[PDB]
Design a protein around this nucleic acid. Sequence first.
RNA 1: GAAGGGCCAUCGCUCAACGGAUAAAAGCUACCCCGGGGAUAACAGGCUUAUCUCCCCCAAGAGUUCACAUCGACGGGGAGGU
Length: 198
Amino acid sequence: MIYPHQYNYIRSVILRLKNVYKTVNDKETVKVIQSETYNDINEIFGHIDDDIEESLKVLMNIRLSNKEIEAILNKFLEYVVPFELPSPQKLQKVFKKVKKIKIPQFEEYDLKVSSFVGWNELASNRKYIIYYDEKKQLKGLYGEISNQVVKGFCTICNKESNVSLFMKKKGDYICRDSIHCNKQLTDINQFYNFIDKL
RNA sequence: GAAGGGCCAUCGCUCAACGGAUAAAAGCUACCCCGGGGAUAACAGGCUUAUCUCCCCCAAGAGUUCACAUCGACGGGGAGGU
Ligand SMILES: [Mg+2]
Ligand SMILES: [Mg+2]
Ligand SMILES: [Mg+2]
Ligand SMILES: [Mg+2]
Ligand SMILES: [Mg+2]
Ligand SMILES: [Mg+2]
Ligand SMILES: [Zn+2]
């Protein structure tokens, strides 16, 4: 079992390796990336199954294919555990102030790749985000979200993309989609740092 | 004669549930009872469709480039009657 952010990190290194094959014309430079990618996967899993080894083998080969990548990603995805959505009665305890709070249905894959879950009402222009801390107690935050979206560096994912200003007076632009933000996010601590910044 | 009445004048009410039932009044019933009501609720039907489910319009964008492979922000229009 691996964290969502870890999987995103694995995905990124795999994409890098494919990009390296695409761009780099030197095998030796490629080899260093191949080893680094291998090391990164070895960092993720203390013990690697034969399927992971097969995936590594496919990754190691210079002639990587996007279908092969997707298959490797699917195998890695299986290891990942989806984010647990709270019970509505539990959620009501999380958000007592909020009345008739509604969570949009999340795809299982989305939950698997999402370190945290967040949704915006839009009608009230308020975004509600739920996450499990290091203590593993679910923490819900409700804050105003700007309707306007403009490209900007986002603290939550630590990436530059189209973002919506979030208010909860310091103002920070955050990605409109939390799932998109999660996909961009590579470390759960980085999201925690954003929460600490709040 | 007086006592006590009448007439005139005036005083005493958050009688505020303010045309004030008495000077004087709160609750429980799954131990319940009678007379009634579909004039009125709980089930199902009917109407309705906010909500809900589903389908669309525009296409900012994402997708190496490339809106429309796939996905689709902000908005807009419906259908169904679970
Ligand atoms: Mg009266
Ligand atoms: Mg009376
Ligand atoms: Mg009777
Ligand atoms: Mg009737
Ligand atoms: Mg009937
Ligand atoms: Mg339609
Ligand atoms: Zn973000």
